Design a binder for this molecule. Structure first.
Ligand SMILES: [Mg+2]
Ligand SMILES: [Mg+2]
Ligand SMILES: [Mg+2]
Ligand SMILES: [Mg+2]
Lengths: 49, 31, 48, 290, 43
RNA sequence: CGGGAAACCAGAGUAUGGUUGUGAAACUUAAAGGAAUUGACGGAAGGGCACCACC
RNA sequence: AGGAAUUCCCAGUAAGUGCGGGUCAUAAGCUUGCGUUGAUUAAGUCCCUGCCCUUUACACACCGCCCGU
């Protein structure tokens, strides 16, 4: 969704996302982002802006 | 008592005696 | 990736990473008392 | 009226662009004045056109308005007239959001709260301008807790965007009673930078001129770009000893956007300041204090 | 494009010798202005 | 009329840093124990107002 | 078809219905826009529960001293 994107494959549980909230992430293209909040529908996805 | 500070103040009061037209033209000369 | 690593492995890993932004401040009694001390000082001096 | 409003906006924007030029022209004028008063060299920059600035010095007087300020143009009637504040919510408000909006009416003297039904945002601003509403407040909620606040100055004034962090309302606390409703004293603390002065001005002009003997105090304290809102009433039991009783809501503010236009002008208004969280050094930087 | 870029390098160097050569002459002019201060009031 | 250097004799501004310029607590929130023709309160009445009250 | 208590609400308002966006903050079973249909009662008093003030511009007319420590 424009800036906001849904990411899977980095983690495998909701406990994992809670440990790494606010971590700096980036793409191969060089766009920098932030981990915001975990998602429930798959096991280890999260929301990132 | 500073002479340099007093010297300017004495000058300005005197020039107003000349007149406002003469006040101006003398002021241009100083600048 | 997540597939290679076992489940819940990173919980004990103690990795190092960086945070993007500052965390929100936590309110406690001590912060309340210092803030009230500031308010009382302005009241005495009429520093409105 | 619509033509008049458009004309006043172009006049305001025209003056804002030339504000910096007049300040530099004013600054050069004072340097020449010091050189004349104390006999010294005219500065080499001021050596040419010195006569023209000297001619201007004679023409300057207390009668002129002086250098213009875009802040003064926005808050023209800040001191002379009492502000008129209107509070509204997002469409289909929650139960607790309506309860929060009821309390904000009590905090601001003379404020009014109106129901938001199927009103278009642009239509709301048009009605506020017609009836002389000075400031408009819009509050957002998430899962029954207030999360965002927008403050807009109606006569093409600045629009400030806030996010609420730790909201505790009077309705949660039992058996408090009734509020004082007197004109309050304002305490501003922690704002030292230029932007902090800009933000504190917007919050202060929401309130009217109080009385000297008023016992109502509202405090805005800045700490690491977080503004704490506190409301208190004090009693002087004896000299030098004062008691404080907390009344009213308690919440935190974090500014992230200031725009020149009104909230109906999202697609056109310029941004005076914005928070950039993806900056490489954004984590270790603060903006409301020096 | 490179020719214009090549040209701009010399005026950057040229202005450097311009200010240094003018610098020695500037001090002599400044000393003359001192005498005008004492006679500024007289005329 | 002769020479005058290709002659003759033998300067201010900012900015950024430095350097300097016999006890009031171990004791005390009773104005270290005040000021006052100037100070500190109480009651009653009147004028308003509220989806913090009524109907 | 949701007791006792308790909260909110005056006109395109209460309530119902759909269709979008995710906009450098917040927001995922959630957040915010936009349109559609559209009501009952009320336009006045200080009786309860409280709040803000007062009791020292001489047209006509009206009116003719708040109290106590
Ligand atoms: Mg509704
Ligand atoms: Mg509706
Ligand atoms: Mg029911
Ligand atoms: Mg709907």
């Amino acid at each position: 969704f424009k800036n906001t994107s849904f990411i899977k494959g980095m983690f495998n549980s909701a406990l994992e996302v809670a440990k790494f909230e606010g971590a700096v992430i980036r793409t191969v293209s060089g766009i920098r982002g932030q981990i915001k909040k975990a998602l429930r529908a798959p096991e280890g996805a999260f929301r990132a802006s | 008592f500073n002479l340099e500070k007093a010297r300017l103040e004495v000058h300005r009061f005197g020039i107003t005696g000349y007149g406002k037209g003469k006040e101006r033209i003398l002021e241009q000369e100083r600048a | 990736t997540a597939q290679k690593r076992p489940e819940n492995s990173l919980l004990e890993e103690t990795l190092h990473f960086d945070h993007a932004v500052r965390m929100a401040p936590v309110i406690t009694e001590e912060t309340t008392l210092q803030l009230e001390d500031i308010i009382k000082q302005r009241i005495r001096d009429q520093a409105w | 009226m619509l033509r008049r409003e458009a004309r006043l906006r172009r006049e305001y924007l025209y003056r804002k662009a030339r504000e910096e030029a007049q300040r530099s022209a004013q600054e050069r004028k004072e340097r020449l004045r010091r050189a004349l008063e104390e006999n010294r060299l005219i500065p080499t920059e001021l050596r040419r056109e010195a006569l023209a600035l000297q001619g201007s010095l004679e023409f300057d007087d207390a009668g002129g308005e002086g250098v213009t300020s875009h802040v003064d143009d926005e808050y023209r009637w800040a001191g002379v007239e009492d502000p008129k504040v209107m509070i509204t919510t997002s469409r289909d408000p929650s139960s607790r959001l309506k309860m929060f909006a009821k309390e904000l009416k009590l905090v601001f003297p003379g404020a009014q709260r109106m129901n938001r039904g199927r009103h278009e945002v642009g239509a709301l601003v048009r009605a506020c301008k017609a009836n002389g509403v000075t400031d408009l407040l819009v509050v957002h909620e998430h899962r029954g807790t207030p999360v965002g606040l927008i403050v807009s100055h109606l006569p093409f004034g600045p629009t400030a965007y806030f996010t609420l962090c730790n909201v505790v309302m009077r309705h949660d606390i039992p058996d408090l009673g009734t509020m004082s409703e007197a004109k309050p004293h304002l305490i501003t603390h922690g704002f030292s930078s230029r932007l902090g002065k800009r933000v504190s001005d917007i919050l202060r002009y929401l309130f009217p001129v109080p009385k000297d003997d008023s016992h109502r105090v509202i405090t805005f304290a800045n700490q690491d770009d977080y503004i704490s809102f506190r409301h208190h009433v004090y009693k002087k039991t004896d000299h030098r000893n004062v008691e404080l009783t907390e009344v009213g809501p308690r919440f935190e503010l974090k500014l992230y956007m200031i725009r020149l236009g009104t909230l109906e002008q999202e697609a056109t208004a310029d941004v005076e300041w914005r928070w950039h969280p993806y900056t490489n050094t954004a984590r270790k930087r603060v903006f409301l204090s020096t | 494009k490179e020719h214009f870029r090549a040209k701009q390098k010399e005026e950057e160097e040229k202005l450097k010798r311009q200010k240094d050569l003018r610098k020695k002459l500037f001090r002599i002019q400044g000393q003359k202005e001192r005498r005008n201060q004492k006679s500024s009031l007289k005329g």
